[PDB]
Design a protein around this nucleic acid. Structure first.
Ligand SMILES: [Mg+2]
Ligand SMILES: [Zn+2]
Ligand SMILES: [Zn+2]
Lengths: 55, 900, 76, 93
RNA sequence: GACCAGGCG
DNA sequence: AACTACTTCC
DNA sequence: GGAAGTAGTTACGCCTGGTC
């Protein structure tokens, strides 16, 4: 399963939005990291709870 | 919360307007003397309030919070809606006068209903069928359902319906159709007949086109401002409504009192004109309603249509918050995906960051700093939604009360993502996402390699900076729009982000034959480029004093991937025999002995082997706006981060080379020896003699026309051909004599800047000037200037400038060159306007087309446009210069990977 | 003698059978209204026995993919 | 001397010849055959399109890009086509 | 607020 | 103004 | 088929000032 650019962007955006509203980070992040960078770190590690559905 | 799923458009019924209204307006006044709105006027508080301090009688909300409410004007006599005028005329001439049926046969009715049910998806077929039905009904004279003559109906410009009847035996008269009888005719139309006329039985009714109740737009939809002079400036809609109310009151008074029919008709026509100009002031064949000053009023139609109208001016494009604009300046020392932001803009624009577990300390520090210090914040928003501006006597308390879940609008800091845009916006690379880097001075900074996508040239250019505010928008920008991507153009599948002028020229000065560098220079350039290195490679030569020297090719190879291998001929190939020898050596085994290649090394044949540059010089072919072989291979075989790293390093390296090695252009760059000057002089002399011979032959009738054109055109074409060939030969002589050690030549042969034509015009003759492809002819009769004999067709007399820029132009040649420059400058603006219009049309036609998950391209209603995008499924951005896959490149790469 | 199919511009046309038309419509999950249309008065249609409501498969001879099949319905 | 990919030309030509006839790209062609009312009214003639749509009672299903921008809703392109799902119980490592 | 004029890329 | 395209009288 | 009429468009920002 290979994510497209748009699927990756949507997943990272949704994860960052969730993190900004108190959803706990699934990994360890450096202090001072912005929520978007935390979501990008989460995606790069590979721990992605959001799943895309296709027709 | 809900989202709009669809919008059904219809015609409002009079009962709908009556019920939706909050007031019936009777008084044609706006405000009283004291300044309060007149009850019953256009500004009645039951339609909403706009003046601060007032209160709405329908909502109870203050100004700016009350949405606005509708009112109605019960018209004394019904009027005709101008928008539906032609529709009413078509319906009138397609339906019976007495019963109202469509005047079509029952068999025709059922057949056309069946054909209406079919072919409804597309508008064009339905419209054509409607026109056919309209023609068939219009031609008919007698209603088939009920025997009755159907007098033909004539229609002048708006709201004038005039059917013609036979008043007397053999004499016919035209009878004007008042809105009352027209509306009654429309009400008599049955519901089963509407679909064949195109009308919807429920969402529309033909009778509702004749409007007897006029809705009044809310106060908030037509605000009035008080001028600094103390007078009140009303909207155009307000004035038009006031006039409509006044005329309606006059008509009602004359109707209830009783007046002669002519005066009543005149007042009715006045009211109809007022309503028509209210709906559409620029309707065909109507005198526009002019303001007291003298300008025409802007009404509903003008509110909607136009480039300044509602749709284009406030819906498709609209002004936005959190944006900045200033002049851009170059900055080679920031990465390609970065932008230098002034401290003023960073302090002004803010990024809303919700405080979390990890950024609590940083947000506390920036709240403590406040709006004054740069790493600070402006506002703090509690979870309840109440916002507090940070100021003195607030910073300590707000920092204490930061907690978790609050919002802090902090200043821009390094790493933030923004949108950067220079907005003549032609392609999608006009907006890319850049990483913020805060800078002292008040100008935007941009890496030089990113200029070609923006078409920016640092001559006063300004670019807009937009700060995304939501985390979803920030992620979208940072993932889809960053400058690391979009290196390859979707237009041609080639590199658009590359070296432009100084990178190319410095690369040539680096990698050319005989270019060597000292140890200090090598270490300094490697540190400047950002290349990480702990040991220099073994030197190539040794100076007369024993000093080690490095070749430029080794330094360039220090920043190439260790697996890369490619060969190609660049623009510096002047002797193809050496290139052929190198290719013959390579083709025998594909892994030639490096020393054997070094024996036959040539500047016009670039040959990289295992990341080591063994032959060739850096050119526009290595990296550039088009046809960057090395950059394309690095971005297609190693990723997009490696391409960015290589681009940054090579740009900095070439900049250092060109800066510390010296690159200049002087007067001597256009000098030619006496032999070259004599050869050019003989070239022009022979060209002029040939033109004279052609003119003499044409004067004696000796010349005969070329096929496809007359004698005059034949002579003109021959003369232009001779002049162009003479210019080409003189340019060839200049190219032969100037040489490759000239800096002006260096930047032209390497594609850094300028063509051979510029050098030809600067060191040799300027050549023939022309407008619209013809010789210069506009001026006096038989000549261009009064300094030439009339009827002269010679070379000099028609625009052939025989001087170089260095040699200086004569006044005649100066005027001719001015004409040429003027034609070019005139061409530019016309071309850009036409191209802009064509691009707008193409975009509005192809906006929504997209690739589905099955690989096809489909229209919004589901129509399949392409069963496989590009007929093979390959995106042009990801393609190899338009090819699906570079087969030979893959074969060579794999064979070298395994056999190597 | 001269058929329009021998022209280099014109790609080869062919009428699909009912089974093939059903397979095509099932493949892309579409209705005949969702296909591109070709007029029944078109010369390529008239050169065949095609009638309105029919699907024509066109061997387009792409420059990028070599061959490429394009489908058009016949309308009046 | 301008280099444009063949695929863009193919897309434009296929959209131009999608109705069985060659039709323009402007208001009397591909744009005029768009189903969305607001998309057509945004391009060039505006009052005519709105009045004629109100006459026939046309519906704008908002399946395109232009109208969704006009109303302020996600466009069905790019990231606007991605449907996301998520299993609720999240356990940090 | 819309009209005009002049510029900038 | 200068282009197109309809429309519409002829 | 004319032969006129009629209508519909004609790049994107940005800045300044001046008058209503
Ligand atoms: Mg510029
Ligand atoms: Zn209100
Ligand atoms: Zn009847």
């Amino acid at each position: 399963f290979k994510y497209t650019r748009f699927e990756k962007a949507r997943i990272i955006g949704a994860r960052a939005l969730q993190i900004s509203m108190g959803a706990p980070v699934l990994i360890d992040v450096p202090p001072g990291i912005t929520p978007l960078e935390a979501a990008i770190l989460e995606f790069e590690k590979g721990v992605i709870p959001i799943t895309v559905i296709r027709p | 919360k809900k989202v709009i799923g669809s919008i059904e458009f219809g015609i409002l019924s009079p009962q709908e307007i009556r019920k939706m209204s909050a007031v019936e307006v009777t008084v044609p006044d706006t405000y009283d003397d004291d300044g309060y709105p007149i009850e019953g006027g256009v500004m009645d508080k039951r339609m909403g309030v706009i003046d601060p301090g007032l209160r709405c009688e329908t909502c109870g909300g203050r100004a700016g919070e009350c949405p606005g409410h509708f009112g109605h004007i019960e018209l004394a006599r019904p009027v005709i809606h101008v928008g539906f005028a032609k529709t009413i005329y078509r319906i009138l001439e397609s339906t019976c006068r007495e019963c109202g049926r469509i005047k079509l046969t029952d068999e025709e009715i059922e057949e056309y209903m069946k054909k209406i049910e079919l072919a409804r998806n597309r508008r064009s077929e339905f419209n054509e069928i409607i026109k056919e039905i309209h023609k068939k009904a219009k031609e008919r004279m007698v209603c088939p359902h009920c025997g009755a003559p159907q007098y033909p109906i004539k229609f002048e410009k708006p709201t004038i319906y005039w059917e013609i009847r036979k008043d007397e035996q053999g004499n016919e008269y035209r009878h004007r159709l008042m809105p009352t009888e027209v509306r009654d005719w429309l009400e008599k139309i049955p519901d089963k007949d509407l679909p064949l006329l195109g009308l919807d039985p429920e969402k529309s009714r033909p009778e509702w086109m004749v409007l007897t109740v006029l809705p009044v737009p809310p106060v908030t939809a037509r605000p009035s401002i008080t001028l600094e002079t103390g007078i009140r400036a009303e909207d155009d809609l307000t004035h038009k409504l006031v006039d409509i109310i006044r005329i309606n009151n006059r008509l009602k008074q004359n109707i209830e009192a009783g007046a002669p029919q002519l005066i009543i008709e005149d007042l009715w026509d006045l009211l109809q004109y007022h309503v028509t100009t209210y709906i559409n002031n620029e309707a065909p064949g109507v005198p526009p309603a002019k303001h007291k000053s003298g300008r025409p009023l802007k009404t509903l139609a003008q509110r909607l249509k136009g480039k300044e109208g509602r749709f284009r001016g406030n819906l498709s494009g609209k002004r936005v918050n959190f944006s900045a604009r200033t002049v851009i300046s170059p900055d080679p020392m920031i990465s390609i995906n970065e932008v230098g932001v002034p401290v003023e803009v960073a302090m002004e624009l803010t990024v809303p960051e919700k405080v979390t577990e990890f950024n609590i300390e940083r947000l506390r520090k920036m709240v403590l700093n406040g709006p004054d210090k740069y790493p600070g914040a402006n506002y703090v928003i509690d979870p309840e939604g109440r916002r507090r501006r940070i100021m003195d006597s607030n910073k300590e308390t707000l920092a204490n009360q930061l907690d978790i879940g609050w919002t802090v609008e902090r200043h821009l800091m390094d790493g933030d993502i923004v949108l950067f845009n220079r907005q003549p916006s032609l392609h999608r690379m006009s907006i890319m996402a850049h990483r913020v880097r805060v800078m002292p001075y008040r100008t935007f900074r941009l890496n030089l390699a990113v200029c070609p996508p923006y078409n920016a040239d640092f001559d006063g250019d300004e670019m807009n900076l937009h700060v995304p505010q939501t985390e979803e928008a920030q992620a979208e920008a940072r993932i889809l729009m960053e400058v690391q991507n979009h290196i390859i153009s979707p237009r041609y599948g080639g590199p658009i982000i590359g070296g432009i002028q100084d990178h190319i020229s410095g690369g040539y000065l680096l990698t050319r034959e005989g270019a060597y560098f000292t140890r200090d220079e090598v270490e300094q350039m490697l540190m400047f480029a950002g290349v990480d290195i702990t040991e220099l490679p073994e030197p190539d030569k040794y100076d007369e004093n024993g000093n080690p020297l490095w070749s430029g090719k080794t330094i360039f190879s220090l920043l190439l991937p260790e697996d890369l291998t490619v060969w190609y001929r660049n623009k510096l190939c002047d002797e193809p025999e050496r290139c052929e020898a190198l290719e013959k050596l390579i083709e025998e085994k594909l892994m030639p002995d490096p020393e054997e290649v070094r024996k036959l090394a040539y500047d016009g044949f670039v040959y990289i082997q295992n990341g080591k540059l063994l032959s060739g010089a850096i050119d526009k072919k290595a990296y550039g706006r088009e046809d960057g072989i090395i950059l394309d291979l690095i971005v297609r075989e190693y990723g997009v981060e490696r391409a960015r790293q290589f681009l940054d390093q090579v740009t900095k390296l070439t900049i250092w080379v060109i800066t510390h090695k010296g690159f200049t252009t002087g007067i001597d760059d256009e000098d030619l020896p006496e032999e070259a000057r004599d050869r050019i002089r003989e070239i022009i002399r022979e060209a002029e003699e040939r033109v004279n011979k052609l003119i003499e032959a044409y004067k004696r009738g000796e010349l005969e026309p070329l096929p496809g054109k007359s004698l005059e055109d034949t002579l003109e074409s021959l003369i232009m051909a001779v002049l162009a060939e003479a210019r080409d030969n003189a340019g060839a002589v200049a190219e032969k004599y100037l040489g490759m050690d000239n800096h002006t030549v260096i930047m032209a042969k390497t594609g850094a800047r300028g063509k051979i034509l510029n050098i030809t015009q600067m060191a040799a003759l300027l050549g023939q000037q022309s407008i619209r492809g013809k010789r210069l002819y506009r001026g006096f009769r038989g000549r261009v200037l009064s300094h030439f004999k009339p009827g002269d067709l010679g070379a000099r007399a028609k625009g052939f400038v025989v001087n170089s820029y260095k040699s200086g132009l004569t006044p005649q040649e100066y005027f001719f060159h001015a004409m040429g420059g003027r034609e070019g400058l005139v061409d530019t603006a016309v071309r850009t306007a036409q191209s802009g219009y064509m691009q707008r049309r193409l975009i509005n036609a192809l906006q929504d087309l997209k690739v589905e998950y099955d690989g096809t391209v489909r229209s919004p209603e589901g129509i399949i446009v392409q069963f496989k995008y590009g007929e093979d499924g390959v995106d042009p951005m990801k393609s190899w210069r338009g090819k699906t896959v570079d087969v030979d490149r893959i074969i060579v790469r794999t064979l070298l990977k395994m056999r190597g | 003698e001269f058929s329009i199919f021998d022209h280099v511009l014109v790609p080869e046309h062919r009428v699909l059978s009912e089974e093939e038309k059903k397979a095509l419509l099932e493949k892309y999950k579409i209705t005949l209204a969702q296909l591109p249309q070709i007029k029944a008065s078109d010369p390529a249609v008239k050169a065949l026995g095609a009638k309105p409501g029919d699907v024509i498969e066109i061997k387009r001879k792409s420059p990028t993919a070599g061959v490429y099949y394009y489908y058009r319905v016949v309308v009046e | 001397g301008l280099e444009v990919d063949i695929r863009h030309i193919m897309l434009v030509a296929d959209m131009m010849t999608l109705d069985g006839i060659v039709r323009p790209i402007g208001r009397h062609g591909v744009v005029g055959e768009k189903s969305s009312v607001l998309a057509r009214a945004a391009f060039e003639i505006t009052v005519q399109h709105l009045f004629e749509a109100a006459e026939k009672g046309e519906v704008d299903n908002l399946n395109g890009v232009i109208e969704n921008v006009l109303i302020g809703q996600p466009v069905p392109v790019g990231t606007g086509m991605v449907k996301l799902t998520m299993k609720l119980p999240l356990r940090p490592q």
